[PDB]
Design a protein around this ligand. Structure first.
Ligand SMILES: NCCC(=O)NCCc1ccc(O)c(O)c1
Ligand SMILES: [Ca+2]
Length: 213
């Protein structure tokens, strides 16, 4: 049985966290797959490197250790939704983040609690590539359990996230997140009038999720 431990993010975790995020998102993320070609592994590391110091400083994120191997198998990256660093994104990932803001912005700024230390933004989550289904689902359960604990211990009002894969969307549902938006990603229009995810099937959703703690 997989034995796990959540450890706050430290500065030295940078490459391990990058490895896990890159392996979790590159060629696997449901949104970026429609922006091919030209989405590179470094587009993810470039973002993480730019925010890494603030990400550790804010003390809201953590890594998950397999305590039997003492290696990192997962990570949950969190910010105060109203106190996030500003990243100038150069890659096609800017479209992903502008879409996510399209999903989150209206709801966050008009329906969720105002002020700092209210909205724990679970903005990135990843698990190690070598995890089998039983290790991955359990790491996902464990990080969900720990994100809630961080939210309560840090006195946030709730956990805010946009889930873009069927598994994370279904996980959020059985964890009793409320759906605040279920957007059909192939209907999103870019600033140039194109639908960057237009080739996606109608069934691919972006779901904004929110759970009061
Ligand atoms: N509660 C899970 C949320 C998560 O971990 N990721 C979804 C947000 C995201 C960010 C960048 C991307 O490139 C992307 O496809 C999706
Ligand atoms: Ca340890």
């Amino acid at each position: 049985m997989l034995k796990m431990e959540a450890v706050p993010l430290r500065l030295e975790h940078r490459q391990e966290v990058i490895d896990i995020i890159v392996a979790s998102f590159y060629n696997k993320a449901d949104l970026e797959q429609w922006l091919k070609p030209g989405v590179l592994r470094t587009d993810y590391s470039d973002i993480l490197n730019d925010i890494w110091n603030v990400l550790v400083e804010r003390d809201l994120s953590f890594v998950v250790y397999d305590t039997n191997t003492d290696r990192i198998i997962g990570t949950a990256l969190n910010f105060d939704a109203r106190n996030e660093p500003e990243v100038d994104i150069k890659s096609k990932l800017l479209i992903v983040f502008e879409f996510l803001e399209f999903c989150e912005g209206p709801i966050r700024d008009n329906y969720l609690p105002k002020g700092l230390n209210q909205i724990l933004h679970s903005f990135m989550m990843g698990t190690a590539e070598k995890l089998n289904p039983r290790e991955n689902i359990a790491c996902m359960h464990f990080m969900e359990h720990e994100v809630l604990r961080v939210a309560r211990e840090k006195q946030f009002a709730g956990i805010f996230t946009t889930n873009t894969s069927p598994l994370t969307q279904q996980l959020a549902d059985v964890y009793h997140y409320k759906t605040l938006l279920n957007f059909q990603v192939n209907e999103y229009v870019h600033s140039d009038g194109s639908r960057p995810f237009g080739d996606a099937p109608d069934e691919q959703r972006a779901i904004v999720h929110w759970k009061e703690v």
